[PDB]
Amino acid sequence: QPLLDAVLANIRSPVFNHSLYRTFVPAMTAIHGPPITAPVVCTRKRRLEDDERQSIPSVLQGEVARLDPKFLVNLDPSHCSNNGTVHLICKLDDKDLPSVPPLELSVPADYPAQSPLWIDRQWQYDANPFLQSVHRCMTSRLLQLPDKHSVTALLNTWAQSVHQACL
Amino acid sequence: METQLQSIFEEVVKTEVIEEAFPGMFDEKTKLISCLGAFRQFWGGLSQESHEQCIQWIVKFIHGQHSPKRISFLYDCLAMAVETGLLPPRLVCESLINSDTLEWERTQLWALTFKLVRKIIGGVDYKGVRDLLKVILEKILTIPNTVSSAVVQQLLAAREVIAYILERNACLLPAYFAVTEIRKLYPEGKL
Amino acid sequence: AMALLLQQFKENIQDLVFRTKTGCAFNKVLAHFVAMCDTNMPFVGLRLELSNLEIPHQGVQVEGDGFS
Amino acid sequence: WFCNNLIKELLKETRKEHTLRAVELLYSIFCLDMQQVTLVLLGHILPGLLTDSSKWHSLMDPPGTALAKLAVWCALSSYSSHKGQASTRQKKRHREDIEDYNMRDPLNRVLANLFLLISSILGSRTAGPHTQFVQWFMEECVDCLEQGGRGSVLQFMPFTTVSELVKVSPKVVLAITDLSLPLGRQVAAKAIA
Numbered sequence: 160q161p162l163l164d165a166v167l168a169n170i171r172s173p174v175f176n177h178s179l180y181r182t183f184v185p186a187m188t189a190i191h192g193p194p195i196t197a198p199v200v201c202t203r204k205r206r207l208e209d210d211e212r213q214s215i216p217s218v219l220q221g222e223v224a225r226l227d228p229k230f231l232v233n234l235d236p237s238h239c240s241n242n243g244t245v246h247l248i249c250k251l252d253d254k255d256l257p258s259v260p261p262l263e264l265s266v267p268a269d270y271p272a273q274s275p276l277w278i279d280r281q282w283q284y285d286a287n288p289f290l291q292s293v294h295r296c297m298t299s300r301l302l303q304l305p306d307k308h309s310v311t312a313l314l315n316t317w318a319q320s321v322h323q324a325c326l
Numbered sequence: 327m328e329t330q331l332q333s334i335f336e337e338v339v340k341t342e343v344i345e346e347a348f349p350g351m352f353d354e355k356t357k358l359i360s361c362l363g364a365f366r367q368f369w370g371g372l373s374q375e376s377h378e379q380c381i382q383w384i385v386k387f388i389h390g391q392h393s394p395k396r397i398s399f400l401y402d403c404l405a406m407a408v409e410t411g412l413l414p415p416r417l418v419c420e421s422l423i424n425s426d427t428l429e430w431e432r433t434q435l436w437a438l439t440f441k442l443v444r445k446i447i448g449g450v451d452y453k454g455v456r457d458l459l460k461v462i463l464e465k466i467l468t469i470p471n472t473v474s475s476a477v478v479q480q481l482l483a484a485r486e487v488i489a490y491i492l493e494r495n496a497c498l499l500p501a502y503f504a505v506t507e508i509r510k511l512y513p514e515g516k517l
Numbered sequence: 518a519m520a521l522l523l524q525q526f527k528e529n530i531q532d533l534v535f536r537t538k539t540g541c542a543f544n545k546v547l548a549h550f551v552a553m554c555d556t557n558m559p560f561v562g563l564r565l566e567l568s569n570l571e572i573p574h575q576g577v578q579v580e581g582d583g584f585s
Numbered sequence: 586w587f588c589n590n591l592i593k594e595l596l597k598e599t600r601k602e603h604t605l606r607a608v609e610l611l612y613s614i615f616c617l618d619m620q621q622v623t624l625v626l627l628g629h630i631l632p633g634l635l636t637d638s639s640k641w642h643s644l645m646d647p648p649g650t651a652l653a654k655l656a657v658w659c660a661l662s663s664y665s666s667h668k669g670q671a672s673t674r675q676k677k678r679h680r681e682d683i684e685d686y687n688m689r690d691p692l693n694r695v696l697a698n699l700f701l702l703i704s705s706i707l708g709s710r711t712a713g714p715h716t717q718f719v720q721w722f723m724e725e726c727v728d729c730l731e732q733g734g735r736g737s738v739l740q741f742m743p744f745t746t747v748s749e750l751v752k753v754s755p756k757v758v759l760a761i762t763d764l765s766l767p768l769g770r771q772v773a774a775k776a777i778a
Contacts, residue, residue: 227578227580227581229581236778237749237752238752239476241475241476241708242474242475242476242477242709242710243476266433271392271393271394271434273395295354299353301395302353302395302399303343303346304393304575305393305573306392306393307395308573311574311577312574312575312576312577315576315578316576319349325537326530343523343525344525344561345561345564345576346525347557347560347575347576348525348526348527348553348554348557350525350526350527350528351526351527351528351530352524352526352527352528470713471638471641471713471714472638472641472712472713473713474711474712475708475709475710475711475716476709478712478716514599515599515600516599517599517642517645517646
């Protein structure tokens, strides 16, 4: 119902909106007498400096640090200093036969990253038929994973296939 | 219609199932060759002329995914299909060469595309081959000068294939035509 | 509805998995199956629900030894 | 400004043959003051180009490779024994420079400075022209009877520098292998991969 004041205040859209002071602040000072508006020590400092400058993205290491002790993570020659930020080598230590370690080179946190690429796929996997079939089963299992995550999903499926390898 | 072919290709390639939480026991050769045979039968069926736009639809559906493993497995079946004589190269090259490159956007997709281009770089072609060279150089020039420092080998793949072409030009394809293609890139020196 | 079933589970490698272990009726296997299904279905449902916002990391396990 | 206008005029051919001819003749006309002039030229233009991205525009051209060849040539000539007795040089050989960067030698100091700047430019997070430039540099650095990049083994960067360079084929892998010292064994194992 009270629409005249609304549209009338909306008319004064351009930059010259200052008389509102003389129209309202006398009445406000009359009814309200608050000395406490912003007397406390305060200053606006939005940003000074924000960057890692010390390590890899925190989310990845923080998440992989809580994985099982069955795995072991370390670093290769540093060919992923800034962008990749991870070049990991994992060796499954459990009640099963081990295998060739993965590459584990990830991308930004969107994670469309099939991090291992099997650089030594051909010979190291044609060495024996058993591990060759193991690799084949792994690859067949990987494609069904929608938007897999190298951090958890990839390694988990790899361990699952390696433990199912005994048929 | 084209939607029928798209649905057929989807059914031949899509294997959407439950999350498979429960461990279940029950494709590189069986399913791949089966999909290849099905797509070959659809090829032999009809729509020979309009298979240009049909393969455009095909590559669109291929790019409609996000799992690099899936896109690689997809590209592989087209690779074997073209190398086995079926689906002559010219069509697939002229289709994939445009509208789906995604310049330095999808490093994985870009990489696999240029790898399959390197594979098909044999590519027996008539005088109408300068066009694809122009397309490659036009896509290259859009790349900036300081994009990054880690994505290199993926970009060298384009450099690799263009070097392969420019060097085999002495023995593979007409050289002078390739030279005349560079005139759109070298106007007496333009960096 | 009568949608497809596909027998997507380990049918019938369950016998070989039981025999390949290191450890009257053997109804335990059906018991195990119904138990794992009843205990996984809420989890996979919540997982597919959360798979619309972010982080669809499927099949993660808490330290493994938790058996959950 | 002498060398500035030199490289400016050099960056005008945009064709390999004339750029090569220009740099060949420039190395010759640059003589009679080889050591100090070349040291100052390098220590001014190479940082003056790698420091920002504005100057990266220039080095993108094969003129950049020609300039790298000029740089390594004058460096190898200067490091070797040199008399350098000219009219306008003997009477004008009184200056002072610390370069704000074994032994304490001006030429050696400048060489270490440029090596450190090369290793720094080899850094990540941005690379269009300059990794290729330093690649050309390392390639042309290959030369018999050479002794540059001595890499003193006390507290110096050349070790990690060659490590990162090989982490980018056997040129630097062999240059760092001065005397098969245990320090060199590290970069050997790294280049073995």
